[PDB]
Every structure is written in C-alpha cells, then in structure tokens.
Design a binder for this molecule. Structure first.
Ligand SMILES: [Zn+2]
Length: 63
C-alpha cells in the first residue's frame, strides 16, 4: 500500500493499475509480472519480487 499526493489513491495495491483482483500473486500484475508462473510457485514481477527483498512478502527471485 502506498499514497503520496492524492485524495483517492485506491490503486495502491500498486498505486497504479490494479483492482487487487487482477493483480499479481501478491501485488498488482494485471498483465504477466508476479502473476502466473516463473518463481515463488507463481510468477516474478520485480515489485512483488522486491516485496520479497526488503519486505520478504513473497519468495521468488525478483524480475
Ligand atoms: Zn507484483
């Protein structure tokens, strides 16, 4: 979740393009990032993969 300078930042699954329901495995795919298959038993968006990094959210290998 993230919010900077908007009264409504309800994209904050990614603060961008997700409805938290077409999102990746953890974060906000809605394309082919950490969504389907690549790493962590799922895919690899760097974001979630980043969430794996310092957040330890998921456990693939970022990309
Ligand atoms: Zn993601």
């Amino acid at each position: 979740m993230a919010h900077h300078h908007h009264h409504h930042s309800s994209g904050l699954e990614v603060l961008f393009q997700g409805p938290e329901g077409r999102e990746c495995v953890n974060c906000g795919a809605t394309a082919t990032p950490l969504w389907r298959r690549d790493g962590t038993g799922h895919y690899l968006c760097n974001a979630c993969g980043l969430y794996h990094k310092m957040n330890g959210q998921n456990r693939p290998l970022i990309k």
